[PDB]
Scaffold this active site. Structure first.
Site, PDB file in Angstrom:
ATOM      1  N   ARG A 114       0.958  -1.150   0.027  1.00 26.55           N
ATOM      2  CA  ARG A 114      -0.113   0.001   0.097  1.00 26.55           C
ATOM      3  C   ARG A 114       1.066   1.207  -0.216  1.00 26.55           C
ATOM      4  N   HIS A 157      -0.946  -1.196 -10.123  1.00 26.99           N
ATOM      5  CA  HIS A 157      -2.088  -2.213  -9.359  1.00 26.99           C
ATOM      6  C   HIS A 157      -2.119  -3.467  -9.892  1.00 26.99           C
ATOM      7  CE1 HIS A 157      -4.479  -0.521  -6.141  1.00 26.99           C
ATOM      8  NE2 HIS A 157      -3.349   0.025  -5.884  1.00 26.99           N
TER       9      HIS A 157
END
Lengths: 301, 301
Positions: B222, B270
């Site tokens: 993250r 991502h």
């Protein structure tokens, strides 16, 4: 060991080998021949061992007292033992490199690399590993290990070999007759065939055309298993969408090759199968002593 | 199912999810809210399910009859079940992606990619996998699986976790007190920490400085486990030599980020942890029916 070693390679760093060999055998005389012409300093009669990769035509004729050749992986070759390096982990290093190349294509990394240079966030349609068909062409010791490793990552892994194979979790095809169907169902193909008269030029225009349009092509075997002219043509027409090429017809790859400037090709310079000086030097030093004591040499080809 | 589903994500393709959901439940009403403002057509009272990633502030207040939220991986959130996707293979897909990123750095692929654009054949000193120290920061389900997979490739693999771990073939460190020594011996580091108040900003300037000069940095957790400002600073000073970053503080990564134009950074958008519509749609459709029959929902968070 009462005689000098000469090193030649256009694709390997002489100095690193010299350091490793002289670490392993202090006061071993190691002479690095110059890439291109093979010019080497010193009395050539004192040279008794040659560690080489594709030396210049006539190179061995320089060294009348040569006792041992070591290949770094015939018209002027003398009547002496020829050895190869046995690096027990090359199988591992090769399999790891193949996994890198397969994953790089399967995740569409070349498209993302392009997008970053454009400053843009790229969206692709997500796919599972199981929907991606990966074909390994050649199932010798190296190809079989790479195919088994690929299957651990969930891909629909197929392999091809001249003769029957049973590899757990791999869809194995065999024989020349099976080659078109093997290629037609491979979205990503990995060339891992040893180079023999029967495999030289096997991936020619006709075989490349059996691949599906948009296929992704990885070559880690030898430049001439693949017809380089035909490969470039398939890349230009968009028949092959992208490629990763570690080996070439002429190496180092000449400056004018069209492969260098192709956005959809990654050129790697012999990284899959590179010899490691620290781990190979000991077996070379031991073969020097065996040849000098009249004992048979390890790893003779 | 007697009610509409609304989709929101700036990092996922609405149409692919709509196709998959309507395949799995024909005549399910799927409405794609527009990235940015979240504008969605149709009567919002009819919307009963929300499939979302980081929707705009106030988004859920649009939908008074919402019964179910599904996160695509609190100030306006209503008093309803919240689910995550359980994709039994994300562990595999993540481990495979980490192996790609670790191999890409360990084989110095960024240097070779640069060399190809220069038209030159690059020579590097060969190293064994065993000489390369790779540290996995975080040993939860995802990090432990990636660390075990890395160890199969022969690397000197270390891991760090807040609490004691025993993973076969992995040098495990634990506790905050062990973090500096863990980082100081990691040549390549992989951030795989879940994001909690105790891990938020853990990879700050002080922790980054514990890495050896020339370290290679991979982030698949993250954005905010890592202090992005401090990361950019370390990249600019050459403290971190190169990086592969799949997650960012703001996503999509804004156009003006200095990361896009950095030659020694690979930006991936991502890809490590992407949800797959075909394999996730069935569990969403089943939770719709459970919520509509007053049965407990699968995968509640």
């Amino acid at each position: 060991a009462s005689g000098a070693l000469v090193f030649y390679s256009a694709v390997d760093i002489g100095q690193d080998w010299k350091s490793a060999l002289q670490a392993a055998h202090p006061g071993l005389d190691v002479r690095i021949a110059r890439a291109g012409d093979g010019h080497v300093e010193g009395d050539p009669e004192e040279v008794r061992y040659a560690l080489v990769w594709k030396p210049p035509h006539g190179f061995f004729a320089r060294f009348p007292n040569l006792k041992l050749v070591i290949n770094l992986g015939r018209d002027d070759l003398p009547d002496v033992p020829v050895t190869r390096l046995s690096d027990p982990n090359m199988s591992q290093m090769m399999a790891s490199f193949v996994l890198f190349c397969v994953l790089r294509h399967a995740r569409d990394i070349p498209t993302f690399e392009r997008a970053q240079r454009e400053g843009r966030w790229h969206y692709v349609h997500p796919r599972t590993a199981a929907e991606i068909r990966v074909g390994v062409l050649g199932l010798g010791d190296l190809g079989a290990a790479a195919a088994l490793e690929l299957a651990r990552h969930g891909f629909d892994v197929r392999g091809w070999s001249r003769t029957p194979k049973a590899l757990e979790g791999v869809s194995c095809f065999h024989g020349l007759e099976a080659l078109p169907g093997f290629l037609a169902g491979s979205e990503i193909v990995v060339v891992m065939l040893p180079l023999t008269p029967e495999t030289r030029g096997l991936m020619n225009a006709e075989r490349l055309a059996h691949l599906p349009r948009g296929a992704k092509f990885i070559n880690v075997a030898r430049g001439p298993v693949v017809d380089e002219a035909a490969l470039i043509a398939a890349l230009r027409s968009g028949h092959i969408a992208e490629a990763t090429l570690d080996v070439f017809e002429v190496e180092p790859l000449p400056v004018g090759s069209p492969l260098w400037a192709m956005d959809n090709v990654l050129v790697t310079p012999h990284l899959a199968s590179i010899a490691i000086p620290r781990t190979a030097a000991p077996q070379i030093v031991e073969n020097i002593r065996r040849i000098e004591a009249g004992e048979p040499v390890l790893n003779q080809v």
